[PDB]
């Protein structure tokens, strides 16, 4: 039975109040039909007795309290799913924006999804050869892992995003990634860059895209990740696909969340950001992983720009607390013409233990992982004081470290935005990337792999 109330009691700013209602639930989705034919989407924030406080996505501007109609849909914010979402481009609310054949959805799903039972979860251990050695060796990605990229404005994180989408795939398997891309609150020309790249590479023919622009309503920017993840969990846990999800910019998502919070007159937490920012972001990143007895997986790669290049900022900080590692891009490297400008020292992966030694490489280059970490650390401390001051403490124990950096960032870490290298190649180049440090310097447990190749 279709419900619609035609009398609005109170409108204070972006907030509304509807009286004499019944059977209206929390987080229920509503529609307001304007006197000029326009239809605006809304959301029930709170319900007392015969009253319902709701918020309109497009704002309450130009709304009459006697000449308007508020339809209560009897369901929360949903997404229309189907077999024919691949190859299509959608809105921030799941509406077609590519002007193709409109699809008749099989069903509608709550965009909040459901929490996977931790017992029913299947821990990720399948290695993903991203092609990028900085990632593949030191910060290894795994199917089902949530591994974000921390960048800054002006840095090539968009180039790194497209790169990973192009060349990432699972070893010794016919499985190909189904990419769900989600643009969040970005400009038209920013969104056009992705639309163009996906068409030229043909990645669009194997992808679902949810494009949310900068001048779209703030609520829609918030709904976009949940729209994309609902489509991701659908293609994975119902179609058996291995879905790769990529979102940008998460900073925009947080800023939209901050705006919405202030509109609801909620007291700001640390640095003016909501107290539930950790929780809110956790309802997105935890959607990744695998399930026992079910084919398919969900892999997330969030992307964000760190405000003022500050890592202690709430947005990347709380992201680092939730996700299983992070990939850092610095301007100091990017200024050296390094693409990708990945700094391996602040970078991390929490699921690299079972990914290594199984898919690769039986400790062949899984073992050197902790060395290149520890050696590049002293290699940087040495290069720091040896550049600004005179002769290094030792040219065999202190300036030898400097030799193993400059080229091993201009070569070992360089790679290319449209360049793809295999893991074998990476472990090939890697043994050659120790250029040039003698056998005295490699302080590892083995002498075996120090003799097989140079």
């Amino acid at each position: 039975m279709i419900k619609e109330y035609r009398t609005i009691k109170e409108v204070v700013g972006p907030l509304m109040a509807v009286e004499k209602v019944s059977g209206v639930k929390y987080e229920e989705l509503i529609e307001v039909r304007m006197q000029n034919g326009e239809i605006r989407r809304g959301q029930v924030l709170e319900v007392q007795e015969d009253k319902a406080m709701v918020q309109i996505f497009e704002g309450t501007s130009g709304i009459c309290l006697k000449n308007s109609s508020v339809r209560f849909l009897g369901h929360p914010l949903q997404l229309g799913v189907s077999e024919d979402m691949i190859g299509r481009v959608f809105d921030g609310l799941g509406r077609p924006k590519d002007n193709g054949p409109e699809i008749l959805p099989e069903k509608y799903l709550d965009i909040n999804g459901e929490v996977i039972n931790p017992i029913a979860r299947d821990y990720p251990d399948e290695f993903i050869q991203t092609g990028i050695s900085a990632i593949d060796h030191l910060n290894t990605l795994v199917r089902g892992q949530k591994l974000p990229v921390f960048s800054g404005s002006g840095l090539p994180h968009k180039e790194l995003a497209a790169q990973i989408a192009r060349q990432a795939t699972v070893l010794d398997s016919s499985d190909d990634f189904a990419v769900v891309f989600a643009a969040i609150g970005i400009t038209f020309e920013e969104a056009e860059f992705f639309m163009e790249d996906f068409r030229q590479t043909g990645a669009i023919d194997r992808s679902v895209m949810f494009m949310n622009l900068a001048n779209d309503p703030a609520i829609e920017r918030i709904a976009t990740p949940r729209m994309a993840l609902t489509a991701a969990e659908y293609l994975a846990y119902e179609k058996g696909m291995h879905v790769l999800v990529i979102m940008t910019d998460m900073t925009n998502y947080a800023e939209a969340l901050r705006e919405i919070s202030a509109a609801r007159r909620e007291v700001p937490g640390r640095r003016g950001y909501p107290g539930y920012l950790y929780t809110n972001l956790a309802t997105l990143f935890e959607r990744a992983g695998r399930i026992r007895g079910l084919k398919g997986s969900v892999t997330q790669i969030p992307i964000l720009t760190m405000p003022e290049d500050d890592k202690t900022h709430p947005i990347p900080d709380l992201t680092g607390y939730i996700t299983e590692g992070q990939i850092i891009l610095t301007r100091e490297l990017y200024k050296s013409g390094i693409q990708p400008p990945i700094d391996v020292l602040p970078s991390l992966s929490r699921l690299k233990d079972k990914g290594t030694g199984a898919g690769k490489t039986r400790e062949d280059h899984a073992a050197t992982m902790n060395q290149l970490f520890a050696a590049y650390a002293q290699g940087k401390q040495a290069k720091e004081l040896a550049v600004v001051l005179g002769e290094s403490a030792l040219s065999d124990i202190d300036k030898i470290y400097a030799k193993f950096a400059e080229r091993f960032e201009n070569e070992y870490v360089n790679q290319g935005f449209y360049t793809n290298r295999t893991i074998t190649e990476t472990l090939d180049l890697g043994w050659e990337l120790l250029a040039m440090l003698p056998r005295t310097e490699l302080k590892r447990i083995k002498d075996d792999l120090l003799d097989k190749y140079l």
Partner: protein, 584 residues
């Protein structure tokens, strides 16, 4: 019976009228679904309810029934080796009943199996007068852990009838002749989680726990019945530290609480623990462990309940005379849950938005931990060691949750990002971290090892402290401006950090280090220092010592990988150190 009615739904806060007979802290079924909620406030007929499940799709008009009891846990045989919810719901049974891989709501499930048969062995004779805490028999829940059936609080009288046999946790197994009449007992008892289980008195935690972690057990030790906080930035090693403790500690039972963290981390525990076998006894880790999981995208209010569920279960086995260690990862998410409900209740901050009673809530939690004398005629000894992780924003430990924790606990393992960035694990900052048990632990270690261990810890710490001061000078003037004695001190300090403090948790041998191995390892490192100190005084230069000791120092750097059953290959370095340096 009185049936309430919802009048207000706003996030996890629900208000309902027609509940004048309702009481504070009582549990009630909320709405059509019957989700689990707790009453925290009450204004006349309307009660404010804190729901520990999702409240999306719930509105006014729906019924609310009070259970008449507080948030409680089921305590009895069949509680060990189980992974529970925030409010003690079997996640495995939840998966079986609901036939779903996801978590629904409004589904009631008993915490234990009331159908399973257990063998109850009576150990008390009839005609014996008993009170709260007294053992009437036990159940071999696991081959090691005896689940001792104790007299519940409030029961007082004589044992009239009791007999051994195969019963369930519902069947009466013992009859007590009290003043109020006759009361029959079961193997199960219920207890409110917000109320700490009664004891005779508290005791001083003076016995060091063997965590197996060298940096901890040596320089910043925690005692059985002590409390330790682990504040640090993300990726510092907080969760890893608690994992190592939960698996290597010389403790009878382990209660791990996953509070608002990652779901994969609880999955990793529940999967690997049954595969980790103790060679001496043969039992797996899971057979001494109880799991409580409420992840970050699970209901936020249930983060608080997961804490009280875990500590109460810890108290239950504490009263049996067992040592119990409870891990809370992380306690910051608990505070966030308090902040969430604080704003919903239109309350007043508070620091950083937290409720004003945050300090009290935390202080009451850690005070429930400690070494105690359990109730009973035999006056048995129990203890609860609390290991808590704190997650400061940006690593800034001047935020409320960390400060309010450091004022009631005596152990502080402050993690450092720069150490983690150097892959120096664990990332404990040896300069700023501390343990106020170190003095009492010192005389214990000296007494049980019959060695001057306390002096060894002090000397090793002095070198680390002197290193920092020397590291200030090397920053201004070159390293080559220092005396040979100071150059030696730096090299010994390097050995302390790299060979002793650095400890990989993913290495088969390095993951654990026995007390006897820690002594031999530290003695060797300090032996090289003293012998090289003598050499300098006897004319030898610094460079000549280092070059002629490459081989022996290499044995030192690998003494962490020496198998436990052959520790003699570590002590023989002491002889080699003296011999090789004497040759110089």
């Amino acid at each position: 019976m009185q049936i309430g009615k919802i009048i207000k739904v706003s996030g996890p806060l629900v208000m309902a009228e027609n509940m004048s007979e309702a009481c504070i802290q009582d549990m009630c079924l909320v709405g059509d679904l019957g989700v689990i909620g707790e009453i925290i406030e009450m204004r006349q007929d309307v009660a404010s309810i804190q729901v520990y499940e999702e409240t999306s799709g719930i509105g006014p008009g729906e019924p609310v029934r009070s259970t008449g009891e507080a948030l409680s846990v089921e305590l009895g045989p069949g509680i060990i080796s189980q992974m529970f919810d925030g409010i003690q719901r079997p996640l495995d049974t939840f998966m079986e009943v609901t036939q779903s891989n996801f978590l629904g709501r409004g589904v009631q499930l008993p915490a234990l199996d009331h159908e399973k048969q257990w063998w109850f062995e009576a150990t008390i004779e009839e005609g014996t007068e008993v009170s709260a805490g007294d053992i009437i028999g036990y159940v071999d829940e696991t081959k090691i852990i005896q689940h001792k059936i104790m007299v519940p609080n409030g029961i007082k009288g004589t044992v009239q009838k009791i007999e051994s046999g195969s019963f369930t946790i519902d069947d009466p197994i013992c009859v007590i002749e009290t003043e109020q009449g006759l009361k029959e007992l079961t193997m199960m008892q219920k207890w409110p989680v917000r109320r700490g289980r009664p004891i005779k008195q508290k005791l001083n935690p003076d016995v060091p726990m063997i965590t197996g972690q060298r940096v901890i057990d040596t320089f910043f030790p925690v005692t059985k019945g002590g409390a330790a906080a682990v504040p640090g930035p993300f990726g510092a090693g907080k969760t890893v530290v608690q994992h190592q403790i939960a698996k290597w500690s010389d403790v009878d039972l382990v209660v791990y609480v996953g509070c608002g963290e990652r779901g994969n981390e609880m999955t990793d525990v529940v999967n690997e623990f049954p595969e980790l076998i103790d060679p001496n006894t043969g039992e797996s880790l899971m057979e001494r462990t109880v799991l409580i999981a409420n992840t970050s995208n699970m209901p936020v209010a249930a983060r608080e309940a997961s804490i009280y569920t875990g500590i109460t279960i810890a108290e239950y086995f504490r009263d049996m005379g067992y040592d119990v260690a409870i891990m809370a990862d992380s306690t910051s998410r608990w505070a966030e849950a308090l902040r969430e409900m604080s704003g919903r209740l239109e309350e007043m901050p508070g620091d950083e938005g937290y409720p004003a009673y945050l300090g009290s809530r935390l202080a009451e939690y850690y005070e429930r931990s400690g070494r105690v004398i359990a109730l009973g005629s035999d006056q048995r000894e129990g203890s609860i060691t609390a290991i808590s992780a704190v997650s400061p924003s940006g690593g800034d430990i001047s935020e409320p949750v960390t400060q309010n924790t450091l004022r009631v606990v005596k152990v502080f393992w402050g993690l450092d990002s720069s150490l983690a960035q150097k892959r120096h694990f664990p990332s404990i900052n040896w300069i700023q971290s501390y343990s106020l048990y170190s003095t009492e632990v010192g005389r214990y270690m000296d007494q049980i090892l019959q060695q001057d261990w306390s002096d060894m810890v002090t000397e090793g710490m002095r070198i680390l402290q002197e290193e920092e001061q020397l590291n200030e000078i090397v920053r201004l003037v070159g390293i080559d401006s220092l005396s040979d004695n100071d150059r030696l001190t730096l090299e010994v300090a390097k050995s302390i950090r790299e060979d002793y403090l650095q400890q990989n948790a993913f290495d088969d041998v390095d993951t654990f280090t026995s007390r006897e191995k820690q002594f031999n390892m530290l003695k060797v490192i300090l032996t090289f220092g003293k012998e090289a100190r003598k050499a300098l005084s006897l004319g030898a230069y610094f460079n000549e010592i280092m070059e002629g000791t490459v081989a022996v120092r290499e044995r030192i750097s690998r003494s962490k990988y020496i198998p436990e059953e052959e520790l003699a290959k570590i002590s023989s370095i002491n002889e080699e150190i003296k011999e090789t340096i004497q040759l110089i």
